[PDB]
Symmetry: D4
Subunit: 179 residues, 8 copies
């Protein structure tokens, strides 16, 4: 019940991302009070997706992650039925209105290119773009097309390494990298 990682996650991310991660995890039958590593992972993924969507230019991205399952899908059908893009098999995170493709955002604790592989065998859809970030500071995207400019992606890497430092300062990073 009383885990250091829970209090650290509640002290690290803003209340909105914490509430959204709690909702998304309870929806799939996972307890934030027990799966604390998955709690931190969901919060980090949500914040990274939000910074990514903010890195655009007003009407650039459509936020899919953070919506309810029935609602997050409804936007996918509306995007597909209006542009003509094939419907993805699994829920993505964003839709680039400038590139006419969905974006899958990953945040891994291992090296940058095995998580892309893991996300590539699962997807195997079509034009769905994959963008991977790592806590080490590296990144990797489809066709080397990193979608955003260098200044926006640098902020995501900096914030990612900031969370890694705060976890290690509380001896919680070693258990985070395992699972």
């Amino acid at each position: 019940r009383g885990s250091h990682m829970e209090d650290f996650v509640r002290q690290c991310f803003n209340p909105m991302i914490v509430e959204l991660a709690e909702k998304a995890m309870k929806e799939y039958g996972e307890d934030p009070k027990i799966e604390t590593n998955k709690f931190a992972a969901t919060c980090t993924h949500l914040e990274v997706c939000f910074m990514y969507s903010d890195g655009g230019s007003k009407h650039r991205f459509e936020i899919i992650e953070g919506r309810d399952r029935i609602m997050a899908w409804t936007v996918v059908n509306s995007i597909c039925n209006t542009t003509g893009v094939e419907k993805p098999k699994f829920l993505p995170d964003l839709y680039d209105y400038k590139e006419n493709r969905f974006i899958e955002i990953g945040v891994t604790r291992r090296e940058v290119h095995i998580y892309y592989l893991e996300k590539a065998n699962k997807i195997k859809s079509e034009k769905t773009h994959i963008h991977i970030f790592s806590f080490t500071g590296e990144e990797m995207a489809t066709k080397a097309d990193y979608t955003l400019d260098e200044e926006s992606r640098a902020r995501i890497k900096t914030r990612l390494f900031t969370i890694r430092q705060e976890m290690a300062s509380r001896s919680l990073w070693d258990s985070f990298r395992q699972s």
Copy 2:
């Protein structure tokens, strides 16, 4: 009195657009509690006009729809008496400060090009631009000049199809497409 479409409209659009649609419909002698399809249509038209005006660049559009009749006209006379453009016969929805022309925004449930025809015989003014959106996801504008960029108009189409899905999920879309 107790109609599903009324509660759906109050749950779908934000309170400001709902209040503006109620005002605009009561002004013309129409009850939102009875003409629920017209209520949803007015709300959708208002939201589409607002997204259109937001798709500009700060000082780009002058919002005519959503103003009171005497006030909405007063801005039309001020626009005409300062630029020299001929006064339109019927109230438009916007004025493009970059193109020196008024814009008429339509949202139809039929195919995109019969509503443009219907709006073309009524207008027949001069340089008044016509821009039509459909729930199917298509669009059509005067001289193929769609005024806004592709990214802004895609958001309008996506949101339009989102409302169509929520209506069909409540079995209210079939009655909406009829009237």
Copy 3:
């Protein structure tokens, strides 16, 4: 998915009570999109408990309903370990700091005194006070001790009958009284 009762509940109660009812129902494995009658019941119970706690005088009641299970219990242990009152078997709704007893608030669709019976066999604790409200406008409390004054309890009855009227106007009240 698209139920009239869902939109009516979202249009009737404020967003905070709706969110709290969604949380409380998802916690116990119940879907607000499917168990719409239970959704309305949870919202009504929450609002009645809140009006009851507001009917006091600043430092009068301690709100138990609407808190998370682990948190709502933690306040019960703190109340018991500081006053000396025996710990209740099941989660109550309030604690009267003026009467040194917990309060169980019920809102039933049947007559007022069978729900009290149903709540009396389940409880059978000790000094836990029971207060029952009905949609018909009647009420019943332990030892005829209605805790609050007449003016506060009249507001709860009035609001309860207001919800019953809005449900019947949408033909949703008959299905509500059944389950």
Copy 4:
């Protein structure tokens, strides 16, 4: 169109009362831009009713005036079906939870006791309380039961005479007292 009374009413009362008076007058087919005296009268009546309801003690009054017709009635049926009081023939302004009776609030430009007469022949219901205020500073209530204390009713009289002074300073009071 451009009437001094309209601008004075918009400068005198707060925007909420002005909007509520506009809604209530448009509901009954009356134009605030044309019936400016009736506009000021509706605004004054609304503000007096609000100060009256504020003169209570938290859970004392139920505000009927300012609600929509279908909604304002729904609260009357809920009050009657829960307390047992006979349903009034015409819409009142408040309900005293402490006295178990409805209150009719009048604000007249003539002497205090002819408007009470006018309101007494129309009503003739039962326990519906009548409370009359005048711009001259006098008042009159049923059974000499003025419901509120002296300090609250003095504020209403003071504010009423303040509006009369501002009208006379703009030469609008003489036309107000006629109609």
Copy 5:
């Protein structure tokens, strides 16, 4: 131009009282940048009047000080024409709705009873109550009727001595007590 007392007054009182004192002093042809002692005196008088009006019970006092001359008078005529109290010769600060009399609030740097004398020869009206506060911590009122309870008047004295300490800490109190 650059006076220590000006910056101290802007750092001591809240922006609203500072703005009201600036307005009241510019209305009578006095510069806050030059008459800095009168600036501090006006701010202190305004704050004392506000704490006094707050010391009541909701509908107790009518605030006269801090209003514009034409507006502050208009409330005096409305109070007199509705209660029957004789109109005062000079603008007072409050009106006690519970005692049916106006209140004149003074804040002096000399002893408490010479300022009352000075305010008594000027007034000499009728039932206008006089209440005097001093920076030394003493007070004096008409007929020993101090209107408010002991707890509210103690706060005013405490705050008054707090300002005297902050002035002396900046060597500005000696010049304040002179003028």
Copy 6:
């Protein structure tokens, strides 16, 4: 005291511009309650200057109009002592950080080019730019350099003609054009 123009000005412009105009007029010994035409003129000039400063790009203009005399000057000395531009003889309205020159904004009721003449004989400084707007919808600037783009200046003309229409609807425009 009770002038139609006063209530119209309070109903037309936002409270901030009204307060700033009241301050600026009381500073120079002019009463807004008496010099109502000058009141409307000051409000219009302030709003036009604000729209002009907003027409830039974040760090483009430095707002001089609307500041207190001693403060509005202090910014002029700071601008001159840091850029090297000669100090103007009379207070301007803006400073263009992109053009290294002050801007004088005029709003006249006569034709556009006699007010520029009137403002040119008074100024006769150096690089101080003059920009004139008229209620008729025309404009005129130094060296035909209109500083802003066409879309921003069109909004100012439209709003100017909107105020002219509202004045004429209340029969206040004829007296406005005289003085």
Copy 7:
């Protein structure tokens, strides 16, 4: 650096009390990141003092704790120089305007009566009231005069035991009770 108690304190108390405790501890040369037990103690003491001051009736208490040393003293001199009460030797927490005495509030982890002893030998002033609360749920005050009513003091005890439970759930309570 990374202590569980720090994150727990930041997750438990509101940001204002946390900031005030950080300020008060840095003022006396103590690090909240190192003296985490003292951090939690300062936060708990501040919250208890705030609930105590809120337990009064508007103008009842004067808050001394939470102010800066020079400021917190300045209010003590102002209270003494206006009421005549002897100046205390050490900074208290409140001043009861109804009882004409200062209040010292203690929150101990041991039994209730040894901390009162410890606070009695240190004080030994005069009429300075001592009120002690414990995490076990007991209390003790001077002359058995508990100042507040039973309902307000019960809330403090309940909240105190809530913090003790959350500490023990994170295995931080055992180290808290030691120091």
Copy 8:
């Protein structure tokens, strides 16, 4: 204790910069009530750094100044470990995401080029950019690369000279230039 410079600093800068300067000075063992010149210097440096960071384009700069020492460093390690830039020896003020270098911002009272020298011997790191501003209105940066455009840096110079004027008007500038 009562210094003119303290009140001037509290009247000049916004409360946030004042609080941040108080925190930063108390962290290094310096009293704002005593080291008033250093207080004004810290406030000016903070405001200049904030205007500099605002002069960018959304995701351009990372604010280092104004953060706590342990936190301000944590961002430096995250920036270095993600971009590959060498870690600076002393805490900088910003990081330019567009130029891949840290920025050191200085505000001196002497001539612009001796403070750059003083900051150059201390630094002597690598690609750390130095940008110096002066109260006289001049500036100097590394490689004549002033990072921002001319319009943003002109605002900083103007505001700097505004503070110098307000200090001299209160006879506080001469003592400021000495230390």
